[PDB]
Paper text:
FMRP, Fragile X Mental Retardation Protein, and its autosomal paralogues, FXR1 and FXR2 (Fragile X mental Retardation Syndrome-related Protein 1 and 2, respectively), comprise a family of RNA-binding proteins.
The Tudor domains tilt toward one another to generate an interdomain angle of approximately 110°. Interaction between Tud1 and Tud2 creates an interface of 257.5 Å2 for FXR1 and 258.9 Å2 for FXR2. The orientation is stabilized in FXR1 by an ionic lock formed by inter-domain salt bridges between E6 and R47 from Tud1 and E65 and R112 from Tud 2. The corresponding residues for FXR2 are E17 and R58 from Tud1 and E76 and R123 from Tud2. NMR titration experiments carried out for FXR2 resulted in similar shifting with only 1.5-fold molar excess of H4K20me3 peptide suggesting a specific interaction of higher affinity than for the methylated lysine alone.
Author numbering: 10 to 64, 69 to 82, 86 to 110, 115 to 132
Write the structure that this text describes.
Amino acid sequence: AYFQGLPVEVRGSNGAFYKGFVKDVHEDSVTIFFENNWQSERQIPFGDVRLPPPAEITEGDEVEVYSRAEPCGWWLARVRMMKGDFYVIEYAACNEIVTLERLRPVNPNPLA
């Protein structure tokens, strides 16, 4: 009851984090719906779950980028260069030019 609809982020097999919402909480996992799929419940172990970030990007900063390699997920990256509103980033999983809507500081929340 208490955790109904809690937003969480879930580690995919690709290392990226995907948004889901809690339905039930068990001793060792949660039942969730992934974002844009309210029909299929999915069970995720706590070691694959973190809370989403609490509610300034400069060159060199570690960031996360919202990308597909699939649904979009948050991927770990670094800002190699910025000029105006263009950001040049490199993925920790592997350059891409993105705008600021695609970026956030690294979620400070650890896996549960």
